[PDB]
Design an enzyme around this catalytic site. Structure first.
Site, PDB file in Angstrom:
ATOM      1  N   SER A 165     -43.521  53.794  58.634  1.00  0.00           N
ATOM      2  CA  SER A 165     -42.167  52.859  58.682  1.00  0.00           C
ATOM      3  C   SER A 165     -42.569  51.288  57.794  1.00  0.00           C
ATOM      4  O   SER A 165     -42.707  51.590  56.453  1.00  0.00           O
ATOM      5  CB  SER A 165     -42.274  52.243  60.108  1.00  0.00           C
ATOM      6  OG  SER A 165     -40.896  51.819  60.532  1.00  0.00           O
TER       7      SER A 165
ATOM      8  N   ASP B 210     -33.988  60.053  62.325  1.00  0.00           N
ATOM      9  CA  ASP B 210     -34.138  58.945  62.176  1.00  0.00           C
ATOM     10  C   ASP B 210     -33.210  58.074  61.085  1.00  0.00           C
ATOM     11  O   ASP B 210     -32.787  58.957  59.944  1.00  0.00           O
ATOM     12  CB  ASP B 210     -35.525  58.711  61.267  1.00  0.00           C
ATOM     13  CG  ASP B 210     -36.083  57.458  60.837  1.00  0.00           C
ATOM     14  OD1 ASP B 210     -37.086  57.645  60.014  1.00  0.00           O
ATOM     15  OD2 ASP B 210     -35.743  56.368  61.339  1.00  0.00           O
TER      16      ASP B 210
ATOM     17  N   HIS C  25     -37.714  58.499  64.788  1.00  0.00           N
ATOM     18  CA  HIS C  25     -38.631  57.401  63.851  1.00  0.00           C
ATOM     19  C   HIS C  25     -39.758  56.984  64.989  1.00  0.00           C
ATOM     20  O   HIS C  25     -39.519  56.821  66.099  1.00  0.00           O
ATOM     21  CB  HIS C  25     -37.693  56.307  63.649  1.00  0.00           C
ATOM     22  CG  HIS C  25     -38.210  55.393  62.674  1.00  0.00           C
ATOM     23  ND1 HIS C  25     -38.528  55.533  61.610  1.00  0.00           N
ATOM     24  CD2 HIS C  25     -38.858  54.105  63.071  1.00  0.00           C
ATOM     25  CE1 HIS C  25     -39.144  54.359  61.055  1.00  0.00           C
ATOM     26  NE2 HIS C  25     -39.605  53.353  61.818  1.00  0.00           N
TER      27      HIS C  25
END
Length: 308
Positions: A153, A250, A280
């Site tokens: 991320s 995601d 995610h």
């Protein structure tokens, strides 16, 4: 969609929708909640110490796995959390797997979090960190030519961006980029489909992406600054080969794809895989979800080959 990930989305999507308008960083942090104890794979050694850097000192946690001899292939890792949350413990298990299954010494860097330290403290931390470590490859029995960078991320973002600085400043040599559902950016005026497509119900929401972009950045103009959207950097060419994993549900699915699609254009070797049944942040459900467990190992294996 994975069965364990489903109970998490159901139980989650029940509580009241958060009010990001008044939601505080202290409160989101104090709001640590979701992620029961998880399995910690074993490694030969785990070392936590301090990198003394100009103006600030950062905690690092090194992971050496069993059955690996010097000089060691490594990985300087940056945890995710929207440049706002997360620390060395929240990602301790993920790092253990990348270390065990990836056969490399993993250095998870505890960078400065926003809003307290706004963009670009994180990026400078990511790059200075890598350098502090590479400068001492000999003290850590490292193979300087097999030192990679990676992250999940926001951590993925830092790794892409660090790859770019390293290229401007001619080193240190980065052998690889491991980007797990990374936030590599895009043109807000022409955002990819996954942004609107997976806007709600899949853990990472549109309202949450905005809240992050708010706590982290100083100005609207920063939305297109390369150090925040490495995908908008002029010459992506000549950057470390990479592996990019994305998740079907995601919002950042097409963002990573967009980055894969860009490096390719500048002639960089890149492999990208979309895990069809995950969301995610799945790496944190390792040993909990049967799908996430498989995916993380698969990701740690790609590291192993790449650095082989």
């Amino acid at each position: 969609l994975d069965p364990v990930i489903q109970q998490v989305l159901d139980q989650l999507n029940r509580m009241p929708a958060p009010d990001y308008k008044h939601l505080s960083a202290q409160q989101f942090r104090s709001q640590q909640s979701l992620f029961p104890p998880v399995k910690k794979e074993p490694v030969a050694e785990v070392r936590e110490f301090d990198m003394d850097l100009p103006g600030r000192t950062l905690k690092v946690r090194m992971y050496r796995p069993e059955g690996v001899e010097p000089p060691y292939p490594a990985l300087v890792y940056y945890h995710g959390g929207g440049w706002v949350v997360g620390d060395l413990e929240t990602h301790d298990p993920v790092c253990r797997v990348l270390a065990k299954d990836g056969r490399a010494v993993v250095f998870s860097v505890d960078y400065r979090l926003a809003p307290e330290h706004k963009f670009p403290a994180a990026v400078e931390d990511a790059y200075d960190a890598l350098q502090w470590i590479a400068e001492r490859a000999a003290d850590f029995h490292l193979d300087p030519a097999r030192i990679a960078v990676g992250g999940d991320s926001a951590g993925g973002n830092l790794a892409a961006v660090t790859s770019i600085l390293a290229k401007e400043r001619g080193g240190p040599a980065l052998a690889f980029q491991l980007l797990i559902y990374p936030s590599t950016g895009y043109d807000p005026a022409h955002p990819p489909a996954s942004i609107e497509e997976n806007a709600e119900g899949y853990l990472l929401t549109g309202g949450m992406m905005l809240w992050f972009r708010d706590q982290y950045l100083n100005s609207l103009e920063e939305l297109t600054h390369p150090w925040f959207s490495p995908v908008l950097y002029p010459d992506l060419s000549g950057l470390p080969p990479a592996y990019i994993a994305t998740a079907q549900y995601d919002p950042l699915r097409d963002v990573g794809k967009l980055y894969a699609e860009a490096l390719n254009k500048a002639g960089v070797k890149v492999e990208i895989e979309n895990f069809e049944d995950l969301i995610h942040g799945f790496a944190q459900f390792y040993s909990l979800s049967p799908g996430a467990t498989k995916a993380l190992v698969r990701i740690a294996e790609k590291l192993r080959d790449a650095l082989a």
